[PDB]
Amino acid sequence: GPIHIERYEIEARDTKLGPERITRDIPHLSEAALRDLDEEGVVRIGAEVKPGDILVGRTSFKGESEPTPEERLLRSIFGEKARDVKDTSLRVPPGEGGIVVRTVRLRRGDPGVELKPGVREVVRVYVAQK
Amino acid sequence: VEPYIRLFEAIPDAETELATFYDADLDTLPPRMFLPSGDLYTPPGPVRLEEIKRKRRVRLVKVSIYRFEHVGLGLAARPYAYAYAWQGDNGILHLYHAPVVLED
């Protein structure tokens, strides 16, 4: 019986709306949903992941017509720091899951690292399927 | 406080750069706050933070929740509630419990 190891991947890229970021600091998520994430937002080795569970936390800035009108005013008034990010995390797909066995994280500008044009960072998670 | 130090320190560590956290104040907009269920918590005024512990990308804080009132001495920011929380590098507050409302 061969063990099935999946390779999951997510990129945080530069965007016209501002940078995507790999992080643990994700809005609208319960403590339980964040439970197995390291301080970077990357799921810990040894964790059991099931469909819908987070492997890698990510947030992105919202599109133009997403915020409410009051939220558009607040931005204009208080500045570009008064913007709400949204949850764009890497989640375990339907019908998959298992145990996290390895992670890899690379950052643009580190020595020897060459990422796609636009990519600030990339994280891969390996899961041994059950 | 101590059980919240426990929860916080159980966040797995990682070699990364130190983040610069958002020191929210009576002067500034409070950041988005969430209860442990994931529900948005909307404060009735600004907050102040007191750092208890920190790692690289997250810190533990005591969050003091204020409300404005027009008492005898004019406009005042007055304490309304408090909650322990962790804060991340988007400045977001993740509450460990619903805020405890302070008795007058």
UniProtKB/Swiss-Prot annotation, chain A:
The gene is rpoB. Belongs to the RNA polymerase beta chain family. The RNAP catalytic core consists of 2 alpha, 1 beta, 1 beta' and 1 omega subunit. When a sigma factor is associated with the core the holoenzyme is formed, which can initiate transcription. This is DNA-directed RNA polymerase subunit beta. DNA-dependent RNA polymerase catalyzes the transcription of DNA into RNA using the four ribonucleoside triphosphates as substrates. The chain holds residues 703 to 830 of 1119 of the full protein. It comes from the Bacteria.
